Symmetry: D2
């Protein structure tokens, strides 16, 4: 769809599941060269690699923990070694777990801040360093959430991580705009990824979540991958420092509907 | 680029010049059917019509003042009569003029509010009425500005109009999301349209404006038309109630750059 | 409470009822001189006058329609003629009525925009004109709503009016900050004014509204008057261009509570 | 000024210098009981204690590093042991240092996130735990910055910390609103604290900073302490989850002044 994406090198964290996988596959359809970062020793990244290739792209897989500086550096080095360059960095890895805030252990707080915010900082830092050193008008996409604006009781760590990611993104966007490097967030609402399959298998929880979505349906991963492909492309040439919410209207305050 | 736009009917206000013209031409490239609303016969809407057709689309022209309810209704009726339906409504007409706020005449305030905000309300209202009556999962795009968030001394009317347009858009998006009707704003920064050509011909004013744009350049109309085409397409299927800023980073507070 | 408010001249629109009346009385407690604007001779402005005086202030009453330029000018002139100066202008008059947006008559749109937004523009304009001409470090407070950020299906006019008021306020604040004139909004949530007494008399509607308020109660007018007194005082000396929300948490997205 | 603050117990982090010291002294003027947390005895916390007492309050001092969980717990325990209860928690400790973002060391990122965001989380968590366990309608104030909204090149860690603090605050406010616990941020612009004395001693840097402030002057610490006293008081009874900016108009985009 986006001719300028053909042959571009895109690295994606958390790419063996969910939104990261859908983005990898979509970038394959755009004939990009994808670096599939995976963490967990339970995910089948090679299957994603095969789907990327089948869709029309190239792909390499690389294990790495985004909370480890050396692993993030190695993601970027994998792009350089396999494909010659890096054009697009997508920091997508993330996690959450519910705890009443006054009972929230510091270990849980640290893990969520570390993965969701610090991990995106490290990936952004390493990609931008490469872009600046090589005069590449590169692109960074940080996967945020409606919860960079919507508070989230029981998930104070997650909300803080994404609120932080917003200002991290905006700062990097301002700082590197003169070099033609764009940095943007995507803010998904509720999306039907495999991590959510348990929750949405319970018809009551599925219905409750749907009741908070004005458009009335839980989104599909492809609807988020569409946003990433567009933002990375030259169609979005004048767009930097934004959060593009793709949420079926969640951020519009669903409690205030007429009906 | 967006196969689903082929044969879609899009009506655009203020389409004989500047961003509206660029959007008409881009929708032509997408093989859409364009209703070109124009304000004055001196504007040469037929030239825009021919460029839409040359780009690969179909087009008709219709004169109309968006401050007149009957004229707005007639824009929508023109789509129905000439092409059989309406799929996308783009409320783009606008104007501005500088006056110190404490000296701003009510006539100037009324003209800007009436054209920029009330005009978009009427167009949105008439399009959505049609969509609801005919079960069309239609789309409304309202042309806003960075000045829905960035204050604008000497242009208090314009800032108010776009701040108002933001909440109008979000309200309509929330209200009609359950019917699959999406409503979004575009927020351009400084764009090199013909209306601005005088200002930017003065190298001092051009340099001053460029100094407020982190990306360092004034955008081209095609960079805004790109946003409209995407938002109107099914690529943006899960996106409603947003403002998509395309501003080279203006909303990131250019005074706070490091250098 | 605020010693610097003693003897200050404050004009308040919509001061014969609800929040405007509460503000008049609070400014009386602060020993200010209050111009009580009222709309209709069916209202009892003299009762408000007596309560202001009993609370410790001075007060005069003046009829005026904020949709009439001459009446707004006369409100300001009343302050000057009766008390010698104007220090604080509070644009508080407002109204709303529910209609589905696709059915909203232009007459209803115009009345709400005219009263809520244009009326506040005129009052702000006339107050600031006086401040600038007489080197007064004056203060403007515009009564907004949570609905300058929260969309409001059935009330698209009201939401637009307050979204517009936000950018109007911020523009005036930026424009006149160098002269030491501060301009701010207050954003109330649900407040127990007599205009709402119908709705809240129905225990079901009272409970429904309370379910959207995290703090669990509908606010009292005095809780808004407290905000006005503070913003007008020198305690808020470094505060300009803000919206101070007093909403029991409504803007925090009540649909996302844990319980 | 605020009678309800008399005898309230307020704990303040970073209270041996700058804004924290000014807040301690202001709460003294309100006849509160102040727990002055300090970081190093190279600061002179006993001098602050004496100033609090001289202003009209009571005070104790307690050393503590807000990056150490047990030190934060001990601040709250100090309030309980010395004064019998805790009513107000003010998380004010913070730091910043400039580094180009692509060169920002993880150690610097971690120290700023840890102090500025995690430290405020721990203080908020411990105070709210105490409030919930003892049915106290307590109050938390988190010291943020204009940089929870204004991006800050060279200070990506600081901006992320305050953007995160915003969503942390809003989450806690939503979560604990039903128990009558309020949680709010203050967002100072440039304030003449001793840490800034060197910078503002350079007339060029002072003038440059002033040029970014619409009101045209750098604020004094007392102007921030005024905001804290108000927010903590029952005057702000219906105010929760907000950020109250006190910035002389910085967040209004100073580059867009009329000129
Ligand atoms: N699905 C949704 O509804 C939704 C909504 C809003 C935001 N998000 C965000 O989208 C992103 C993807 O979420 P998802 O729904 O696909 O769920 P997911 O859990 O499938 O995706 C997260 C991925 O990150 C990986 N990961 C976790 N810790 C890691 C680490 N330290 N290093 C490297 N990889 C690590 C996980 O193994 C997983 O593959 C996350 O940032 C999440 O916060 C998702
Ligand atoms: N160009 C920019 O830098 C810029 C930046 C931000 C926002 N905008 C917005 O984009 C839109 C297009 O602006 P542009 O730059 O192309 O300038 P423009 O002045 O060429 O376009 C405005 C168009 O609206 C038409 N119009 C005005 N009043 C009308 C009325 N009452 N009825 C019908 N048509 C009417 C004009 O004739 C003109 O064709 C406007 O809403 C403007 O506020 C432009
Ligand atoms: N009560 C709430 O819950 C609430 C919430 C958010 C915002 N507000 C805002 O607070 C303000 C006051 O509302 P209220 O709740 O006290 O209700 P209200 O109806 O008692 O007060 C509005 C006042 O404005 C006056 N008014 C109306 N049209 C006028 C005109 N053209 N010229 C002059 N005066 C006119 C009315 O006569 C009335 O005295 C309004 O701007 C309203 O939008 C109220
Ligand atoms: N002064 C300004 O212009 C300004 C502007 C916006 C925000 N702020 C914020 O206001 C707060 C106060 O800053 P200030 O201007 O008073 O400067 P400051 O440096 O004098 O105050 C910070 C205080 O926090 C203490 N502190 C630092 N790390 C700590 C730790 N780990 N544990 C405990 N205490 C620790 C310091 O010792 C100091 O007393 C900070 O959070 C700062 O980010 C200040
Ligand atoms: Cl909600
Ligand atoms: Cl700026």
């Amino acid at each position: 769809m986006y001719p300028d994406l053909k042959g571009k090198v895109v690295a994606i964290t958390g790419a063996a599941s969910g939104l990261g996988k859908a983005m990898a596959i979509r970038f394959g359809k755009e004939q990009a060269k994808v670096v599939i970062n995976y963490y967990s020793n339970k995910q089948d990244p090679n299957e994603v690699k095969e789907e990327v290739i089948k869709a029309g792209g190239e792909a390499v897989v690389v294990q790495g923990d985004v909370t480890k500086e050396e692993d993030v550096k190695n993601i970027v080095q994998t792009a350089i070694k396999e494909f010659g360059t890096l054009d697009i960095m997508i920091n997508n890895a993330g996690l959450e777990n519910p705890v009443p805030s006054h009972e929230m252990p510091l270990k849980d707080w640290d893990k969520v801040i570390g993965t969701n915010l610090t991990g995106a900082f490290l990936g952004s830092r390493e990609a931008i360093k490469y872009f600046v050193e090589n005069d590449i008008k590169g692109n960074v996409i940080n996967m945020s959430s409606v919860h960079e604006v919507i508070p989230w009781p029981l998930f104070v760590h997650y909300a803080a991580s994404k609120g932080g990611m917003k200002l991290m993104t905006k700062t990097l966007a301002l700082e590197y705009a003169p070099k033609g490097i764009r940095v943007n967030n995507i803010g998904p609402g509720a999306i039907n990824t495999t991590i959510n399959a348990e929750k949405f298998a319970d018809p009551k929880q599925k219905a409750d979540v749907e009741s908070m979505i004005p458009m009335g349906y839980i989104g599909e991963p492809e609807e988020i991958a569409a946003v990433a492909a567009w933002l990375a492309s030259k169609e979005a040439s004048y767009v930097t420092g934004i959060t593009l919410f793709a949420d079926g209207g969640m951020t519009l305050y669903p409690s205030f509907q007429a009906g």
